[PDB]
Amino acid sequence: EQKNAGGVGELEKKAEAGVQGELAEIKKIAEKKKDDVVKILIETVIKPSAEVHIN
């Protein structure tokens, strides 16, 4: 039981390492594409479409 409890810190360290590894890529992608995404969303919101749903 003590040996099982010995790896609690090691498992937490591995989980934190994996979380940080994923978060690095996530933050990098977000920083790289945030301006483009915001521009696309602003263009979509500011430009409406006029149509009649009868046809």
Place this chain on the structure above:
Amino acid sequence: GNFKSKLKKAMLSQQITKSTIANKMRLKVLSAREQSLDGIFEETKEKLSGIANNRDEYKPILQSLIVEALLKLLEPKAIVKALERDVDLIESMKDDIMREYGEKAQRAPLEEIVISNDYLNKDLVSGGVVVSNASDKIEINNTLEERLKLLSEEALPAIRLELYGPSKTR
């Protein structure tokens, strides 16, 4: 034998701890991936409010919003609800809206449109107009905040594709 059962229970507890650590890592990775979307949406909303703050740029946008509301509220009398601000903006383009609704719908021009005195909430609505029917009984909430809120959830898969490539054969 009892101690072997206890050791099996201890191994199960160790596996439980490992599984909990793995689940926490996966949840943290998902949280890190999905955190930035809310900030992006908030920045987009602030940018939309700033864009609507400029009357010269907002005038065509506001006119187009009222028109796209009208073409789906196909009635010859309707009421428009706007902010305390720029009510004279809608006032000055009344005939323009009437005629362009008439020619886009291939119908007669709007016979009567009136700005409702029940002005919108300036703190909540950052531009736009909630056009309602003549009886104030059919509402069309076409506001700068409402459109952004509607599009934020809709554009999620496209945003994901922009942020990262695919991983499966569609």
Place this chain on the structure above:
Amino acid sequence: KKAVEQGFNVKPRLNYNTVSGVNGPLVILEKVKFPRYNEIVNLTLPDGTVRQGQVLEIRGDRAIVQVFEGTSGIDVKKTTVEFTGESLRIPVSEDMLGRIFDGSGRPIDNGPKVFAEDYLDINGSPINPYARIYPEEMISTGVSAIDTMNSIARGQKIPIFSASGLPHNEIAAQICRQAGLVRPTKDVHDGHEENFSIVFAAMGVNLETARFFKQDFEENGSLERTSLFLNLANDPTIERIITPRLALTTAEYLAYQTERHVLTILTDMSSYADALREVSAAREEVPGRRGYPGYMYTDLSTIYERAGRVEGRNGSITQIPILTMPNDDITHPIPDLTGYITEGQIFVDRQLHNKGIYPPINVLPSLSRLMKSAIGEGMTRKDHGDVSNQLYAKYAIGKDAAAMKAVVGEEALSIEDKLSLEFLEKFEKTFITQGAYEDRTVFESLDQAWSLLRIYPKEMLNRISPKILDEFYDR
């Protein structure tokens, strides 16, 4: 290329403070523009409480909204309802594995909303009859009662019939924690690109039992392969109807787009049928047999046929719906239609449960209609089918000999019946009896079945071919 750029288009979703009245779990709107059949709404109570609902009926300017979690406190002067774009769609993604979801698809763990790859329609589509193939592999559930006998093919729709008080939930949890392909065992740990996933759906599940599912799958490696769904009894019941639809949509996406082997487990189909009854009676609809709606056959067909292997795509869907017999009767509509639609069934027996044996699978009335395809030489092991047949025959002989015990006496039985009583005792005590956390691989299960079938001399093993006896009896 990914033609998902249409998601940037924004559509005007309207808000209506025009509720004419409230009638049960339904609210009715008079003025809604350009009616189409089904949509999704998010209506707000006068006190600001946001509530969700669906659309039921459509005619000329006719719209009726069936609000989730009831319509308490809804008035006609302050409540407003927001009409979303179209019908319910689940945000689905490859990294959905390892996530726990509510019946509405909103995750209930501490993680965020799933980062969608695409929004998938919940109903599905009709698979072309010109593009179907047979299930031709085996899914090892780790339960020797289901592996050696009642083997589940890779694509087979096989239910688990149980009663109200029996531990069908525990068997479902064990299957989900232990399910996997036989191939990694057969391929000497060389095959790993054939990824395996599980979609677990809980319907009408009790709060304690839902907590048990969540805690158990969290505390094991099952979650990493599992996309999990819960629906509590006090939760809205149309959410209970949505839950299997969400589970099968996720499973279909995974298997037929990511080329994964997905095992789908649906828990308490009886609660789903009760929810069907409630929603069908919500509209002015005449009840059918035993009160259930007359189209329950079609709905269960739609749920169940979202399974099997398909042409082209390398994935598969294996479905194990679990239902409770309301009165321990086959003739009840739910088990009757489930048997009429699925392939075979697995029986969890009340008396076998009372006798203290777990997992209490009753072998005699349970068959797997597609067991032949799961059996083979490269598939599982060579002796599998013959051992299964011999075990079934010996168990039946032991059972009716035990029945005769009280009519003719022990001494009046033949050596067949003596060996059969011994075999039945050892069988129901060691082979069927399996620890809730014990994972017998299929070859281990076959070895146990051989060590237990070695009671009889080779002459008495009639159901097994001599070619197999000369190979496996002597070890």
Place this chain on the structure above:
Amino acid sequence: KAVEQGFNVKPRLNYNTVSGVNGPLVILEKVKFPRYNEIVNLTLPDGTVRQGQVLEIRGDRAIVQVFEGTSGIDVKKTTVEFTGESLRIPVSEDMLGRIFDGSGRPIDNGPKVFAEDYLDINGSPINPYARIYPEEMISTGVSAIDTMNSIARGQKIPIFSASGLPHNEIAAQICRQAGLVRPTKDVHDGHEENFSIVFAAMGVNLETARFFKQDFEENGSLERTSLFLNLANDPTIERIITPRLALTTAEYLAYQTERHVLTILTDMSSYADALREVSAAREEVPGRRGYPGYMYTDLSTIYERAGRVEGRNGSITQIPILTMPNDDITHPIPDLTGYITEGQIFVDRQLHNKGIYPPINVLPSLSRLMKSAIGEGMTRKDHGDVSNQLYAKYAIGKDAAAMKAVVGEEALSIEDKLSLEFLEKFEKTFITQGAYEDRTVFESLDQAWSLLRIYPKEMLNRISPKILDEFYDRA
């Protein structure tokens, strides 16, 4: 007494505006402020006057169920006069010894009841915080009832019977022999020894009404009974109010004059049929096989107005009689009766065909408040255990007879043969009783002990050892 407010003339308004008539009810339009349950006097063009309650109001439209039938009703000349209040029976202590029509009109050449007060035929609910349990057993003299299903003063208990069975004879016998096992009056002096019977006859043969009248005359109970006879030839929906008239006059006597009323309802099946006729003419939603869906509440209203109330020295012992249409408890009439009543006496057709009188089957019969009316200081301390043992032995006798029908007699145990012997002697001597016998509960208990002494002490397991070794060897 503040009844001086009766000196108030309220001019009734007459409606010559009948809109339509169908079945037992008439519809009149253009009614000025109709009251829901107010009765109306409508005069035919012939000139006769008939009464009728208002079933329901709708704007200026009133629906009236004319009690004396719709024969002769027209539209041109029929005028309806609207009495401002609902039905009220003129009630007084002098109506004892008088015979009344189903509408309460006298049919003994006597005058109208010189009313001391007018009572609505519906009554008022009783505060539960002011109720008292009917502890006092009444000795009906019938051994089939006293020993097994003892009735306490203030109990509702029907005589479940059928066509051609002597339910009338059993009711007359109970009326003749009604009396407390331990009367408060010392040697029948100083207190009301004799019950004051209120007998309502509805949808009943002239022969049965004549039999009841003659039996009350012979026993002398006529001078202290009021008969509300609604014969078969009498109007059909006049049976709606006759149990209400009888129960209101019974409530007057028991709760206002402090008498002990033994209310007998001759045929509740006819009342249920009249209710069904009215409901069918009303196009209401049926509840079961054409019966109204509110029949539970109607039967609750009729039956619940019985028992003892706090602060009053009187009580109502209600013994309605109803004929099961097909000898079955499962019919809506007896089913809805038993759901609200506190017991029943089952007159069994098979028992009657065997010549046994009274043909009371004890297995379906029950007295839900017998438990606290017998024992120490009331009846004898062995009564409860003796009744339990007799019921168990009779049930075992029926089971053994069924088995003997199925398998041979030799397959039956010694217990079963003793059960058949006990059942035969039981039905032939203990249940069987002359119509004029009036055996006391102590004689019945002694006979029951003589019956039980067929079995040895060991197999009277359902009675306490104290009672067994105290009473078994008395002989």
Place this chain on the structure above:
Amino acid sequence: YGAIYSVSGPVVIAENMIGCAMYELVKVGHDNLVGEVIRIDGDKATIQVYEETAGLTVGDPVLRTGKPLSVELGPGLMETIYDGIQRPLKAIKEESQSIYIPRGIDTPALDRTIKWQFTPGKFQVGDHISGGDIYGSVFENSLISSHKILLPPRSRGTITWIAPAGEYTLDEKILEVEFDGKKSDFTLYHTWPVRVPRPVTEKLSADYPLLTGQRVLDALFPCVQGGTTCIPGAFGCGKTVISQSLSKYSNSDAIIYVGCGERGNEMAEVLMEFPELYTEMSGTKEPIMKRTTLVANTSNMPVAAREASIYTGITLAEYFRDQGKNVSMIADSSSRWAEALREISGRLGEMPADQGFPAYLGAKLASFYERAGKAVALGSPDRTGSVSIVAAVSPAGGDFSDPVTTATLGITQVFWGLDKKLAQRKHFPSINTSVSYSKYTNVLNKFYDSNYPEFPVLRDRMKEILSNAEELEQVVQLVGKSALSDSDKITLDVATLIKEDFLQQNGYSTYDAFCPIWKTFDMMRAFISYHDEAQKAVANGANWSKLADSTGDVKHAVSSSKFFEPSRGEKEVHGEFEKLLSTMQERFAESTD
């Protein structure tokens, strides 16, 4: 503001009633009749009324109160009797002096004249306080001493003024909280809608058994504190004895008896038995009524009150659970509640399911049952209460084919089904040991492992013996006991002994009126020792026909073990059971040779 339009049954349609929400209760007519809205159609609001409707006409005004059907929660709830909508019947008698309840009487649901002693809690002026926070305690009874006064769950704000220690009636301001500048006065009580469950910080998994005392229930089919339960409810000792035992010995800090559809005589029986029952909390006989509040809906009461009776009861139970009290709630004749729902549906004309019952019956019973459970109280300091529903269904000719039991089986966790054959043989309690079940048997493993470790395996063995003997009796009724072996005869007679001396409880004698858990466990191990000792003895050459005669003394001893008086204390009676076990083992060893 309102006007009646047309009335049929206890359902009233009122016009000019715009703006009224669903389930809002209104005042109908000049007598201010209490009535709840159930359907809205423009201004026409369909109101159901909780009393009589005969002889009415259009025109009576209707005033809307703006509140749902709420219940007054606070000091004075305990030891009182209420109707379906919480009208104090004792106060009704004191204010009316009649055998009839006044029409539309609006006496306060909770006594205002009595002034209680208030001890201010931890919170002071300026402290932020949220819903459910205990800002003071009140001495109500000797059994409910320190009745926690807690802020209403929906309220929140900062304290601007708190009353000092003293005596305050219901009508006295106790606490002033400020939220967004809106100061709101809080008295010693608060209202709360009966439909909405009281919020909970976290629903804990139930972990402690609700000891009922009946040996079959506490042994084979256990019920935990906070768990749900379905009881046969039929005539006999199945329901009344269970209710009395849960009242007197279940170690619940309070009980909320609610009855709907019971006959007036049964209500009268309940209303006087309870005040004369006592409990020994610690060397003191205290009335159960001090730990009891009762809802007394009857059959004469209208359908709306019948429907709302158990909702009021469960809201009271939730309120007392919010103070940390372990509350047991008995809903006798829940099938009558379902019948009230059916009658309301028929009045509304909505299409039902099954045969006649509304389809949402399953959903509503699921919600009502799931309002129970071990829970962490909403406010601070952290507490842990638990409401245990013990609901009684009633057969209507059918045993389990009725929709109410069919839904309950899937909803509830503990089921105690009636055995009709046992009742036909006057065997009490008359529950069925084949169809009844308790899913907490696995949860209670941790409780058993700490006090009675052998309890689960012994219960499993007892169930196995009963099932095996049941199937053997089924196969022997048509054959005869001639061919059965010694093991079969042992199984049959051991199960007969179990049925006649362990499962059977009269419930009235001084012994085994409440069989404690330790006495139940001791007799379980005694009976199992008898069974397996006989089985081992006949595993040798001992003919069991001779063995039964030679060990009749031991059979009588194990049978009469049920006659031990539990009042003697666990120590000496456990010593007696150990002596019995040793005597049994040595006697069987002697008789084997």
Place this chain on the structure above:
Amino acid sequence: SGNREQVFPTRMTLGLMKTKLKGANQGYSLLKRKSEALTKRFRDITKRIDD
């Protein structure tokens, strides 16, 4: 057609009927095989009587 037990028809009676029918079927099988064993022993005994 055939015969009936003249019992009033209800679904409770239907349940009693199916349980009685399955009991009758299991008894048929049980006594049929018991008679098979008894006739085997009886043929043994009768040839024993013959010789």
